[PDB]
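User: Can you model how HXG sits in this protein?
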Amino acid sequence: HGEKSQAAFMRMRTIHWYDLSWSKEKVKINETVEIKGKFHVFEGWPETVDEPDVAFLNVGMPGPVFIRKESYIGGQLVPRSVRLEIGKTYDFRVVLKARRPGDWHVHTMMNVQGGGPIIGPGKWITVEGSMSEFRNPVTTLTGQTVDLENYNEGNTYFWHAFWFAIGVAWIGYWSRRPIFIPRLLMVDAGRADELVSATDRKVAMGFLAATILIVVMAMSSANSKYPITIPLQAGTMRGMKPLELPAPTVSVKVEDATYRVPGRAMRMKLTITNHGNSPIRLGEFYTASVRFLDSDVYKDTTGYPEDLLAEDGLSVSDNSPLAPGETRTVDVTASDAAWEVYRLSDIIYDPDSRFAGLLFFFDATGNRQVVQIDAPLIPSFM
Amino acid sequence: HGEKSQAAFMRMRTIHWYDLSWSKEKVKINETVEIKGKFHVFEGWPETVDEPDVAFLNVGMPGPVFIRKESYIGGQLVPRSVRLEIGKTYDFRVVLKARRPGDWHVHTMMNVQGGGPIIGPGKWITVEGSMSEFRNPVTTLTGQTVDLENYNEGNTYFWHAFWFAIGVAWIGYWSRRPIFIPRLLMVDAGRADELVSATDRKVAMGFLAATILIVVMAMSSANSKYPITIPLQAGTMRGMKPLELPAPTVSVKVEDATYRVPGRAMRMKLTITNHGNSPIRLGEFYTASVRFLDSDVYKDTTGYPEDLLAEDGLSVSDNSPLAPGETRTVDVTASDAAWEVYRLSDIIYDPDSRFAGLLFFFDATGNRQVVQIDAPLIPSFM
Amino acid sequence: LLDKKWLTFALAIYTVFYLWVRWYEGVYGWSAGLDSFAPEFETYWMNFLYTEIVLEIVTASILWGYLWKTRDRNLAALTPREELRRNFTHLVWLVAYAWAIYWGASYFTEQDGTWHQTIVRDTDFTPSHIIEFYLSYPIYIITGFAAFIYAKTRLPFFAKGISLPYLVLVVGPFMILPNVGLNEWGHTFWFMEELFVAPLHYGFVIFGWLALAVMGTLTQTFYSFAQGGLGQSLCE
Ligand SMILES: CCCCCCCCCCCC(=O)OC[C@H](COP(=O)(O)OCC[N+](C)(C)C)OC(=O)CCCCCCCCCCC
Ligand SMILES: CCCCCCCCCCCC(=O)OC[C@H](COP(=O)(O)OCC[N+](C)(C)C)OC(=O)CCCCCCCCCCC
Ligand SMILES: CCCCCCCCCCCC(=O)OC[C@H](COP(=O)(O)OCC[N+](C)(C)C)OC(=O)CCCCCCCCCCC
Ligand SMILES: CCCCCCCCCC(=O)OC[C@H](COP(=O)(O)OCC[N+](C)(C)C)OC(=O)CCCCCCCCC
Ligand SMILES: CCCCCCCCCC(=O)OC[C@H](COP(=O)(O)OCC[N+](C)(C)C)OC(=O)CCCCCCCCC
Ligand SMILES: CCCCCC(=O)OC[C@H](COP(=O)(O)OCC[N+](C)(C)C)OC(=O)CCCCC
Ligand SMILES: CCCCCC(=O)OC[C@H](COP(=O)(O)OCC[N+](C)(C)C)OC(=O)CCCCC
Ligand SMILES: CCCCCCCCCC
Ligand SMILES: CCCCCCCCCC
Ligand SMILES: CCCCCCCCCC
Ligand SMILES: [Cu+2]
Ligand SMILES: [Cu+2]
Ligand SMILES: [Cu+2]
Ligand SMILES: [Cu+2]
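Assistant: Here's the modeled complex, given as structure tokens:
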């Protein structure tokens, strides 16, 4: 819900999310929904964004309407920040547990230490039930099971109220007598030395000694109880395992790319060379969370968000099968209302008019090839 | 002597020293002792430590009880800081010349520009003789041989004493007359204009002119003598040649790792897959300068420090030979007094409870394989 | 008569209006207020911004102009009892200023430590910003200016000169509003981290410090209270 405002070229060339899947579209309270997919770190990472040396796999959502039970990059849990390598493809998996009823737009996002949020596609997930039914149990290494919704809440309230009461008692003790104007007049007109006299000093000594003694006793008691404590666990985690993708058998060279101002379409001319031994066909163009599909070649079945999915938004001038070894140049047009709804047309406002995306090529048997394209995007006005 | 205080996880995952050797254990004055070995830069380098882009091969010792005659990374001398690559293994060689009699704990260490000292294993080396017998000769490109112990000492003493004498002469010249209270009274009560009169101004002019002239003449004389001088040679040295190790034929997956609090043992469950064509056996586990050995498989003969060596500290549930292609899961326990002496048990205080180490696998013929393992280390209390 | 029930209204108007504002932002925070380019955002928060800016400008102009036009020309012939009554009215103005300062600089400011820390910003006009900077700040600025003008135009102590502590207390917290430019500039450009303690916040802080001039302002009001009707009793 935080994208459509970021720069179009920065959304195009940071991170490409694909193979996204959602386990469920509608859940009950305490029910789990799992989000899977892959993201590729673009080679032409913008210089204004710091390299993803420190990155965190986050969830885009309006507060804890879900709780993040687990999150994985590769196959290993990532509760801390992680290091990503430019040009590598990683697979991710986020497990969410429903907490608050309603209709929520859930995004998978990557926060980069020096570049800000990179928001992936968002999907509407319905939560039904009552928040009062939500439980977040956890078992500690000390052998006790607690609910994270209310654990330590009573202790926190008690201690804060106790110390607030001590301070209020001090202030009220001094506030029983007249406060401002008579005391000001006494201090000004001659030496005061009358508004602070025993047993006021004795009361202050008692307050100070009691404060120190209570702090020490409370610390000792909180050490006898909970004798086993550990510090906060933090630190960027290295050695994220990237996907070992096979080398693509399709090479694509972008010969100019244009978009009409104003308009809802993007046009580019590609020289596609088919290696390997199977006839390929262009099935998809993904630019920034928007999938332009050639419906005659490929159809989406993973429940991709409709406002981000162009079922027939990809038109190829000659999308006949490309025989192996054969090279041809075609005009590819990606047109959909999403191009203007998600403000991908506002790249005219950007200080770097370059686009990046993913082309998905499919053969007859159905196996697909992913190739990455990037080129300057030239607006056309007449 | 500076380790056992650093964080256990940081000592575990920075740099792993192995194949360490010492040419001699007891030396005479002016005798040379050589320290050799390999160090591997851990892939999971902690984010709190700057990457070893600028690193210096140092020696941990109580002052110049030895002088560093030579130091090598790869096969080339490294008198300056060097650049190391994460994940690479380098071989090193430090040549030390004994200078001060006594029993010294000599460590090989790596200082990293933004992370501080990484201290390797330390070995007690005895030095016998007299410091007065120590010589540090060196031959310059100008064809003169000097002893670095006392070269230029007389000149330094002479010039410092000369300038100190000049300053003391100035102060005493002004201090022959009364100093503080009469001069203060003269300055306060009326205009002073009497305590600084000729020939005081003439003496000050003489002092200033003599100072400038002596500085110029001394610089010219020190340029006529020593006509050939070079600036200090500094600058990080790139292109350190790492060892080209063969790819290991053993793959190990750590399925949980635990240590008792309190305790002197660490337990982990490993899934070991034997590739290649020889039966392997687990012989060693090195975690942080501590070598846990399975005495039935391997014995140390390189004179490793005893307090860092656990001869039978490594117990494997099933350490029978592992046939090629066979995969088995075993429980590995590393137990020794060193685990508590070097405070490796204090990882419970650390904000990142993850360990790293090296497993050494040996076959029947004796050739060994080095595999690296890293996993979270979970304390157990009950 | 002396202190009258204008103090009750001074507390109640801010309390009720800001409770309604909190209800409004609780209802339209999500669901017309998350997406800054949705049409419903324009009808529920951009319209709110426009209406509140126009109403704040009109109210400030009317209130300040009325206070300045009804200024007491013959301050010399003011009885001590009337001066005491005017001092109490000025104290009511200061109470309203303190209440508005609380609502602006604590509640709705930290309410952001709750809005952004949870959502990914979509604009310089977050519904909460449409509440904090374009309401929790102009409202307290208007109240502070009105209190200063009332002191200057009804209290002989605060007449015949501009009180430095009052001017600081009135203008420094006002400088937080133009400081929003530094907030925006140093959110989009400098610092994409939602760090609340980022140097892009030493702008409300520095000028938040100037509210400490309330101490000098209040000792000045104490002296103004204790001019003719200082007692006796006090120091007697
Ligand atoms: C120092 C001088 C301050 C000046 C600024 C004051 C800002 C006032 C609010 C701006 C509203 C806006 O701009 O929006 C206009 C809103 C948009 O809601 P709607 O879509 O019509 O839904 C129906 C309306 N509900 C959602 C509120 C039910 O509707 C309105 O007409 C209602 C605005 C009522 C404001 C007056 C009540 C305040 C609480 C009572 C104690 C004073
Ligand atoms: C007479 C005295 C007045 C001087 C004040 C003028 C404003 C200075 C403008 C800086 C522009 C510049 O110099 O350079 C601009 C540099 C270039 O960095 P980058 O490579 O784009 O980094 C990329 C990192 N991003 C993507 C986050 C930008 O961005 C900066 O680091 C901004 C540093 C903050 C300086 C402003 C501090 C204001 C203090 C406010 C406290 C009250
Ligand atoms: C006599 C007093 C001297 C004051 C000392 C000032 C130097 C401190 C700045 C260090 C910069 C830094 O390192 O930043 C620390 C983290 C940034 O986190 P990061 O993005 O991970 O940084 C990674 C890149 N660094 C670490 C190399 C920069 O938070 C900060 O931005 C600093 C917050 C400062 C809060 C304390 C100031 C209180 C304000 C009081 C006035 C209103
Ligand atoms: C919707 C906006 C309504 C604002 C109403 C403003 C009322 C008019 C201001 C005013 O002049 O005084 C009102 C009261 C009572 O003081 P008055 O005596 O009426 O003021 C003049 C003094 N004089 C009679 C001796 C000449 O003085 C007060 O203490 C009134 C405090 C009101 C709180 C401030 C509200 C500002 C919200 C932006
Ligand atoms: C925006 C940031 C403010 C900058 C701070 C500058 C003001 C600080 C000093 C100050 O307030 O004094 C101005 C007067 C006080 O009386 P004086 O300054 O003595 O002069 C009175 C004659 N004058 C009204 C034309 C100024 O006070 C008034 O007369 C104000 C009431 C009249 C203005 C009403 C019209 C404004 C409608 C928007
Ligand atoms: C001194 C500052 C008081 C701030 C209290 C506040 O923000 O109240 C809103 C909150 C809203 O929670 P709730 O009471 O459950 O009503 C929800 C209504 N909305 C969602 C519109 C806020 O609770 C109340 O309205 C209690 C009334 C307190 C009167 C001083
Ligand atoms: C009164 C203390 C002020 C200390 C300033 C500070 O903490 O700045 C941190 C920042 C270091 O940037 P960093 O924290 O790494 O920011 C990470 C996020 N990006 C890269 C988007 C800015 O340094 C600067 O850019 C210069 C600040 C000038 C202050 C007058
Ligand atoms: C001057 C007060 C110092 C208090 C020290 C208390 C130490 C208690 C150790 C648990
Ligand atoms: C005012 C004194 C300047 C001295 C300059 C000496 C230059 C000597 C060149 C060797
Ligand atoms: C990246 C280093 C930033 C250093 C900022 C220093 C601020 C000091 C303020 C006086
Ligand atoms: Cu959304
Ligand atoms: Cu990509
Ligand atoms: Cu030592
Ligand atoms: Cu290693």
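A couple of observations from the model: Residues C 193, 197-198, 202, 205 surround diundecyl phosphatidyl choline (ligand 3) (CB under 6 Å). The interface with chain B takes residues 54, 81, 83, 141-143, 228, 230-239 of chain A (CB under 8 Å).
User: Helpful, thanks.
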